């Protein structure tokens with residue numbers, strides 16, 4: 671990490687490893703493993719100087735290559751330089767002890783896909799979620815995407831699995847947490863691991879990426895949200911989706927999805943990038959849906 675010592679640039683400023691805030695290892699205590707390993711080897715932790723700071727701790731297995739090490743460092747740099755409420759904060763790092771740690775804002779609600787799946791309405795918990803909850807999650811992530819767009823950062827992998835919630839209950843805030851794809855790109859894995867079902871046509875055809883490619887992905891995220899955590903294009907394979915979407919195919923509305931919300935999805939999925947909304951427009955249309963009583967009084971389906 672010191673032998674290659676990569677620099678990272680965001681918003682015109684250049685940073686290096688030496689700019690990360692090193693937290694002494696003795697101040698860090700691991701409490702428990704977290705989640706099913708979506709975001710990697712992640713633990714709930716405590717940082718103290720009492721009233722200790724609660725954190726997520728991402729670890730780097732010591733049995734990783736020197737390039738995994740570099741990926742890890744770059745991931746830390748990227749997330750440390752963001753400054754927005756809908757992007758997970760980086761508390762600091764602990765790189766001078768092994769295994770290496772990145773310290774992250776603790777998102778007690780877990781990842782958005784799992785949350786949607788586990789908090790689906792069911793006969794026992796009839797009103798676990800409401801349409802307004804979903805629109806608020808959508809707004810939250812759109813707000814983070816707008817921040818990235820304004821700072822000319824293309825995320826390349828906007829998807830529910832890469833978003834997290836602060837807490838499970840009312841008052842939850844959704845945030846973008848994973849930046850691995852953008853990391854891999856900034857440092858450039860294989861064809862079968864690409865997020866095909868979240869990618870626009872010109873991503874395949876020409877490999878051209880812009881903020882309008884995040885707009886497309888956000889449309890798919892909206893479908894994930896309002897379907898309550900379903901896999902996009904259910905029962906289609908990656909190559910089937912690639913051929914479907916290229917030929918103009920689009921997903922049907924999620925069950926009970928209000929028309930005004932589905933129309934945001936279809937606008938996000940315009941074949942021509944220039945016909946897709948930027949995230950300021952997406953935010954406007956989400957807000958409009960939020961104001962519409964017929965939208966927010968639509969009942970979600972029961973599982």
Ligand SMILES: Cc1cc(-c2cc(NC(=O)c3ccc(CN4CCN(C)CC4)cc3)[nH]n2)ccc1N
Pocket residue numbers: 704705706709710712726728749758774775776777778779780781784785788834838847848849
């Ligand atoms: C690498 C990385 C990790 C994180 C991160 C992860 C967490 N949190 C959890 O992984 C978690 C999982 C599962 C639960 C448990 N469930 C139980 C019931 N659920 C309905 C909700 C939460 C809680 C937290 N906070 N921050 C953020 C950014 C980055 N780059």
